[PDB]
Amino acid sequence: KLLGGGDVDHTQYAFGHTKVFFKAGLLGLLEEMRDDKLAEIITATQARCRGFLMRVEYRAMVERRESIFCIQYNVRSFMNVKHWPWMKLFFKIKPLLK
Amino acid sequence: SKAAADDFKEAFLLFDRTGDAKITASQVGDIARALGQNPTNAEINKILGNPSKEEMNAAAITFEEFLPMLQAAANNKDQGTFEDFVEGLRVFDKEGNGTVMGAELRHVLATLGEKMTEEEVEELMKGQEDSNGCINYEAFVKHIMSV
Amino acid sequence: DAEMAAFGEAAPYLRKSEKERIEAQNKPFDAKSSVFVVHPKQSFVKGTIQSKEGGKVTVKTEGGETLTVKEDQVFSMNPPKYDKIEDMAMMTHLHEPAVLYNLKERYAAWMIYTYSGLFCVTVNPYKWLPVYNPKVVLAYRGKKRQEAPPHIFSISDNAYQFMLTDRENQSILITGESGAGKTVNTKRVIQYFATIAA
Amino acid sequence: FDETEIEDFKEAFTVIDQNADGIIDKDDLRETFAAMGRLNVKNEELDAMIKEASGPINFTVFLTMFGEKLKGADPEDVIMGAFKVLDPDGKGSIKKSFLEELLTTGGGRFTPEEIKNMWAAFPPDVAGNVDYKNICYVITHGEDA
């Protein structure tokens, strides 16, 4: 199952009842070259992703922009108010209403 | 060149949190990606060190160093070929249909090579993989190259 | 540990405690320097590479000795992960020395059965062991050789298995020099058959 | 200000204005407090409420005074909207340390000291960020319920 991942030659090895078999040193050489070739291929494919990844973060950060404020200010009110006679009054009273 | 794109300087004012017109060396990797450049993180690391620049100690920046580093990274955009991206994932799963099993792509993107966090891996699969556990990478790589 | 019970008493001669293992596989190792080497008096002894004469090698010893021997008088040494490997053929270092050395180590620990591919190596204890133990006999009963440690009943049972599974006849080829103690095994194999299917 | 919230302030204005002429004077304040059980309401409390206005307390002067004190007042449905976006899987009250980190690291209004004051009367669950909903209740209507 493990070997499932990796940008590795799925050739170069071979499994059996007690162990896996693996090449080096030619096929070993091959792979290596290959390895570099994915950093390229990979390294480049990573980037965009990375890039792109944050590019979605900005779209969220931004959306959020106001919903925070709303939350921000909104709380502050209360902290000030909750101690105000008039507001406590409204409070006990707010229920008798319809 | 200007084509003098002065919007790169306006985007540097959106990434500098202090407003002094300097951007730390740790932000330069992600801001090159946000200007339309995908240098790998080892490449961003090498170049830095190559120039006896240490990303380990406090850093500041000036626009006069960030502009030529973005112009040195801009030649490497010829490495972004989509034939090799779709053929990479086509060799990663059997049968004639482009589907990676969910956890195969998530564990490979977090642990193979340049480590992507599993938070970023979940944010890149969110929407393209449905509840069958099969990621169609024909549309997945299409949407990853849409940004 | 958990597994081993069947043998229990024999265990120590079949397998080692789960930390004895752990304490052995998980230890410091310096590949580039650690090596096996030729030796005029003793066949191959181990040592550490000191220098490099461009195609000559100077090595320290394990006993304390220094020899400058050819490049191919020098042989790598398996990472500790392969200490007393049940199957030497799983080693990533298929040498002459590493084989000698594996056998040797698991013997000094009183393990007489070590596999080398398909073979079932067996070393003369020269003393008594709870291995032929009437508990073991059962233990090895119905077990592939990967479900149990290196032992002759492994071979002997698998044969049987295989016998009924594949519907093919089987064979066991015992061989060694005059003092290797084959009759003993042969006999012991035979009892095995008689018991487990009488 | 949504229109039902302005109708709630019109009903509270009519319950404190017991002369029904449209202007809450100091006698209305004292007789509304005496009808709620305040037999010892001092005249200096009534004078401090009238000292917050520049003129007589008619309906638009009462609305502008409450507007200027409640410039971040949020109805319970919009506070539960934002808390359903913070817990997007539904049902669960969100962790204490997650709300402390996200208040600080996003905004200056979410700085810690203020977070210790949030935990301080908004009890544990509320403070912690685990429960949810009781804090929306007490932000729209104060005091312990």
mmCIF file of N, CA and C in Angstrom, chain A residues 4-7 10 34 39-58, chain B residues 14 30 33-34 38-41 43 79 84-85 92 108 112-114 116 120-121 123-124 143-145 147:
data_model
loop_
_atom_site.group_PDB
_atom_site.id
_atom_site.type_symbol
_atom_site.label_atom_id
_atom_site.label_comp_id
_atom_site.label_asym_id
_atom_site.label_seq_id
_atom_site.Cartn_x
_atom_site.Cartn_y
_atom_site.Cartn_z
ATOM 1 N N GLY A 4 2.230 3.098 -2.927
ATOM 2 C CA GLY A 4 1.157 3.720 -3.657
ATOM 3 C C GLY A 4 1.610 5.116 -4.033
ATOM 4 N N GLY A 5 2.140 5.886 -3.057
ATOM 5 C CA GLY A 5 2.611 7.233 -3.356
ATOM 6 C C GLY A 5 4.090 7.340 -3.795
ATOM 7 N N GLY A 6 4.464 8.546 -4.230
ATOM 8 C CA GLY A 6 5.808 8.863 -4.648
ATOM 9 C C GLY A 6 5.931 8.989 -6.157
ATOM 10 N N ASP A 7 6.759 9.905 -6.641
ATOM 11 C CA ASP A 7 6.919 10.015 -8.066
ATOM 12 C C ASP A 7 8.066 9.074 -8.549
ATOM 13 N N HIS A 10 7.652 2.442 -10.473
ATOM 14 C CA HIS A 10 6.911 1.344 -9.882
ATOM 15 C C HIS A 10 7.293 -0.038 -10.464
ATOM 16 N N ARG A 34 15.226 10.847 -13.029
ATOM 17 C CA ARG A 34 13.822 11.008 -13.019
ATOM 18 C C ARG A 34 13.426 11.883 -11.879
ATOM 19 N N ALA A 39 11.002 17.392 -9.743
ATOM 20 C CA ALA A 39 11.145 18.565 -8.930
ATOM 21 C C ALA A 39 10.730 19.667 -9.890
ATOM 22 N N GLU A 40 11.326 19.596 -11.085
ATOM 23 C CA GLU A 40 11.032 20.495 -12.186
ATOM 24 C C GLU A 40 9.498 20.469 -12.305
ATOM 25 N N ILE A 41 9.161 19.262 -13.106
ATOM 26 C CA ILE A 41 7.738 19.036 -13.170
ATOM 27 C C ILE A 41 6.989 19.262 -11.899
ATOM 28 N N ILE A 42 7.534 18.794 -10.808
ATOM 29 C CA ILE A 42 6.799 18.948 -9.573
ATOM 30 C C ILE A 42 6.859 20.342 -9.028
ATOM 31 N N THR A 43 8.097 20.743 -8.685
ATOM 32 C CA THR A 43 8.406 22.039 -8.118
ATOM 33 C C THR A 43 7.559 23.148 -8.764
ATOM 34 N N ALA A 44 7.430 23.072 -10.071
ATOM 35 C CA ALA A 44 6.621 23.993 -10.820
ATOM 36 C C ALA A 44 5.157 23.754 -10.560
ATOM 37 N N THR A 45 4.782 22.489 -10.425
ATOM 38 C CA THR A 45 3.359 22.228 -10.191
ATOM 39 C C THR A 45 2.995 22.522 -8.753
ATOM 40 N N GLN A 46 3.994 22.553 -7.924
ATOM 41 C CA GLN A 46 3.693 22.835 -6.549
ATOM 42 C C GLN A 46 3.283 24.275 -6.466
ATOM 43 N N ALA A 47 4.266 25.133 -6.802
ATOM 44 C CA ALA A 47 4.136 26.567 -6.839
ATOM 45 C C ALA A 47 2.715 27.110 -7.119
ATOM 46 N N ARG A 48 2.227 26.858 -8.318
ATOM 47 C CA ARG A 48 0.925 27.307 -8.798
ATOM 48 C C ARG A 48 -0.102 27.004 -7.714
ATOM 49 N N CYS A 49 -0.062 25.749 -7.307
ATOM 50 C CA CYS A 49 -0.909 25.291 -6.234
ATOM 51 C C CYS A 49 -0.800 26.248 -5.045
ATOM 52 N N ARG A 50 0.430 26.338 -4.510
ATOM 53 C CA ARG A 50 0.767 27.175 -3.374
ATOM 54 C C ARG A 50 0.156 28.532 -3.639
ATOM 55 N N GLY A 51 0.546 29.068 -4.789
ATOM 56 C CA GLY A 51 0.098 30.352 -5.253
ATOM 57 C C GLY A 51 -1.378 30.326 -5.073
ATOM 58 N N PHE A 52 -1.996 29.591 -5.964
ATOM 59 C CA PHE A 52 -3.431 29.413 -5.978
ATOM 60 C C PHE A 52 -4.033 29.187 -4.626
ATOM 61 N N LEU A 53 -3.288 28.513 -3.802
ATOM 62 C CA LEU A 53 -3.872 28.248 -2.519
ATOM 63 C C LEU A 53 -4.170 29.483 -1.730
ATOM 64 N N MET A 54 -3.212 30.359 -1.751
ATOM 65 C CA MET A 54 -3.395 31.587 -1.028
ATOM 66 C C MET A 54 -4.328 32.524 -1.761
ATOM 67 N N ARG A 55 -4.377 32.369 -3.070
ATOM 68 C CA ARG A 55 -5.239 33.225 -3.879
ATOM 69 C C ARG A 55 -6.674 33.084 -3.445
ATOM 70 N N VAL A 56 -7.026 31.974 -2.772
ATOM 71 C CA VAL A 56 -8.422 31.731 -2.368
ATOM 72 C C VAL A 56 -8.614 32.286 -0.990
ATOM 73 N N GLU A 57 -7.478 32.424 -0.322
ATOM 74 C CA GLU A 57 -7.484 32.955 1.012
ATOM 75 C C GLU A 57 -7.787 34.422 0.974
ATOM 76 N N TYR A 58 -7.209 35.105 -0.018
ATOM 77 C CA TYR A 58 -7.536 36.470 -0.140
ATOM 78 C C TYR A 58 -9.070 36.654 -0.348
ATOM 79 N N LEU B 14 -0.211 46.143 -0.818
ATOM 80 C CA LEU B 14 -1.286 45.336 -0.243
ATOM 81 C C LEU B 14 -0.735 44.180 0.588
ATOM 82 N N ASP B 30 5.467 33.884 -1.632
ATOM 83 C CA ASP B 30 4.019 33.890 -1.849
ATOM 84 C C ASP B 30 3.568 35.078 -2.690
ATOM 85 N N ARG B 33 4.148 34.318 -6.367
ATOM 86 C CA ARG B 33 3.032 33.488 -6.813
ATOM 87 C C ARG B 33 1.761 34.296 -7.044
ATOM 88 N N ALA B 34 1.570 35.333 -6.243
ATOM 89 C CA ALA B 34 0.414 36.221 -6.405
ATOM 90 C C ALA B 34 0.569 37.249 -7.532
ATOM 91 N N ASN B 38 5.202 30.970 -10.622
ATOM 92 C CA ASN B 38 5.252 29.779 -9.757
ATOM 93 C C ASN B 38 6.669 29.207 -9.585
ATOM 94 N N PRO B 39 7.562 29.886 -8.869
ATOM 95 C CA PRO B 39 8.848 29.277 -8.549
ATOM 96 C C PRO B 39 8.684 28.300 -7.392
ATOM 97 N N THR B 40 9.336 27.156 -7.501
ATOM 98 C CA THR B 40 9.272 26.164 -6.418
ATOM 99 C C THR B 40 9.933 26.736 -5.170
ATOM 100 N N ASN B 41 9.554 26.229 -4.013
ATOM 101 C CA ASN B 41 10.075 26.786 -2.754
ATOM 102 C C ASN B 41 11.570 26.533 -2.544
ATOM 103 N N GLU B 43 13.680 26.689 -4.975
ATOM 104 C CA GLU B 43 14.250 27.630 -5.941
ATOM 105 C C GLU B 43 14.283 29.036 -5.326
ATOM 106 N N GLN B 79 8.523 26.453 -17.566
ATOM 107 C CA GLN B 79 8.463 25.119 -16.968
ATOM 108 C C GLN B 79 7.022 24.688 -16.647
ATOM 109 N N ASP B 84 2.370 17.658 -18.876
ATOM 110 C CA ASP B 84 3.094 16.839 -17.915
ATOM 111 C C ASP B 84 2.380 16.779 -16.568
ATOM 112 N N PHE B 85 1.496 17.728 -16.315
ATOM 113 C CA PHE B 85 0.754 17.712 -15.054
ATOM 114 C C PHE B 85 -0.382 16.695 -15.122
ATOM 115 N N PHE B 92 -0.638 7.828 -12.303
ATOM 116 C CA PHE B 92 -0.818 7.597 -10.869
ATOM 117 C C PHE B 92 -2.040 6.721 -10.561
ATOM 118 N N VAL B 108 0.081 12.210 -0.886
ATOM 119 C CA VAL B 108 1.208 12.517 -1.770
ATOM 120 C C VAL B 108 1.508 14.011 -1.816
ATOM 121 N N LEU B 112 5.187 14.205 -0.156
ATOM 122 C CA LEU B 112 6.177 13.914 -1.199
ATOM 123 C C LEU B 112 6.786 15.164 -1.823
ATOM 124 N N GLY B 113 8.013 15.430 -1.408
ATOM 125 C CA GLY B 113 8.779 16.558 -1.950
ATOM 126 C C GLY B 113 8.592 17.800 -1.096
ATOM 127 N N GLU B 114 8.040 18.839 -1.702
ATOM 128 C CA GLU B 114 7.771 20.064 -0.950
ATOM 129 C C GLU B 114 6.456 19.893 -0.194
ATOM 130 N N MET B 116 3.207 20.139 1.483
ATOM 131 C CA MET B 116 2.037 21.012 1.581
ATOM 132 C C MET B 116 1.232 20.598 2.805
ATOM 133 N N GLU B 120 -4.000 23.011 3.484
ATOM 134 C CA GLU B 120 -3.978 23.454 2.087
ATOM 135 C C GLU B 120 -4.379 22.356 1.107
ATOM 136 N N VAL B 121 -4.103 21.109 1.455
ATOM 137 C CA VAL B 121 -4.517 19.997 0.595
ATOM 138 C C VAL B 121 -6.036 19.830 0.595
ATOM 139 N N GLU B 123 -8.132 22.287 1.106
ATOM 140 C CA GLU B 123 -8.659 23.474 0.424
ATOM 141 C C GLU B 123 -8.484 23.400 -1.096
ATOM 142 N N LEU B 124 -7.626 22.508 -1.561
ATOM 143 C CA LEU B 124 -7.441 22.305 -3.000
ATOM 144 C C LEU B 124 -8.267 21.144 -3.548
ATOM 145 N N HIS B 143 -9.051 23.438 -13.046
ATOM 146 C CA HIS B 143 -9.419 24.467 -12.065
ATOM 147 C C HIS B 143 -8.216 24.964 -11.265
ATOM 148 N N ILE B 144 -7.180 24.145 -11.168
ATOM 149 C CA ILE B 144 -5.956 24.575 -10.486
ATOM 150 C C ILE B 144 -5.152 25.534 -11.363
ATOM 151 N N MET B 145 -5.304 25.394 -12.671
ATOM 152 C CA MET B 145 -4.684 26.324 -13.614
ATOM 153 C C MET B 145 -5.622 27.470 -14.016
ATOM 154 N N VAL B 147 -6.491 29.656 -11.650
ATOM 155 C CA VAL B 147 -6.030 30.748 -10.785
ATOM 156 C C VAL B 147 -4.606 31.163 -11.141
#
